[PDB]
Structure 1
Amino acid sequence: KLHKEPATLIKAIDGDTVKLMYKGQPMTFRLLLVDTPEFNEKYGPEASAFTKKMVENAKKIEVEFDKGQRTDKYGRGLAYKYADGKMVNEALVRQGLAKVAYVYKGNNTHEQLLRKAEAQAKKEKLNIWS
């Protein structure tokens, strides 16, 4: 079963990538199951600002690795991030600032939760879906 672990914010990079201090080591983390646009693309700045605000204003930040691989080929930690108990991955998708993507079996525990959030954002024609 999955478990949440403490992590400290170093710096928000963009919508789905952040630098955190995990177990005393500075690491770049990439959010599982989602894809925010590049800062240079439509809604890119919006997604960056959303994530930045959410992580910087948080009292507690936690990371939750899935059951599979914990890092990607670029050395980035792969996890679900929580800001005061609220999952950032889900928040972005629910806001239509990120699409469900890179769904790989083994690291897809929250796939249904995220797809539900995407469907609602799409139904509401929010941002990316506008």
Structure 2
Amino acid sequence: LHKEPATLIKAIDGDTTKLMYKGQPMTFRLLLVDTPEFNEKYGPEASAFTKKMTENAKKIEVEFDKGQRTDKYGRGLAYIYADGKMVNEALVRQGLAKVAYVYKGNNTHEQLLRKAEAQAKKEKLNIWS
């Protein structure tokens, strides 16, 4: 896989963001994770976490996987990086997202994220508290 440039347009919630990619506004949905909705327990915390990480970033990048690049809603499906650190993985490591929606052929970082989830669960963090 490879990283490509994007810039943040606006934060949305814990697992969706509005980015400009190849010069066009797109909503991205983070591959392989599920944050709580804002109206759910840890939803506000997840939204705040992804907002901080993406707004504070000097450099946002998107990394598509090998399979579909947009979902049925027209959201881009990618791994999102903020100054080289993957937002998807960070969310899972802090217990603010579960590994979820692992479809065959867009699951390159599955095991990295599962290892993070295991550490978050061992630490009884947030969703695992």
Note whether the superposition's TM-score is higher than 0.5: yes
Q: Distance in 1 between matches of 2:38 and 2:51?
A: 13
* Aligned match of 1:35: 34
Q: Distance in 2 between matches of 1:69 and 1:62?
A: 18
Deviation at 1:32, TM superposition (A): 0.1
Deviation at 1:85, TM superposition (A): 0.2
Deviation at 1:64, TM superposition (A): 0.1
Q: Distance in 2 between matches of 1:27 and 1:55?
A: 15
Deviation at 1:40, TM superposition (A): 0.2
Q: Distance in 2 between matches of 1:84 and 1:10?
A: 16
- C-alpha deviations, 1:21-79, integer Å up to 9, x for none? 00010000000000000000000000000000000000000000000000000000000
RMSD: 0.2
* Percent of pairs with identical residues: 98
Q: Distance in 1 between matches of 2:73 and 2:11?
A: 17
* Helix, strand or coil at the partner of 2:113: helix
- C-alpha deviations, 1:73-120, integer Å up to 9, x for none? 000000000000000000000000000000001000000000000000
Q: Distance in 2 between matches of 1:75 and 1:15?
A: 18
* Helix, strand or coil at the partner of 1:52: helix
* Helix, strand or coil at the partner of 1:28: strand
Moved over 6 A (4+): none
Q: Distance in 2 between matches of 1:8 and 1:61?
A: 6
Q: Return 5+ residue gaps in structure 2 as ranges.
A: none
TM superposition score normalised by structure 1: 0.99
Q: Return 5+ residue gaps in structure 1 as ranges.
A: none
Q: Distance in 2 between matches of 1:109 and 1:73?
A: 20
2:2 is the counterpart of 1:3 = yes
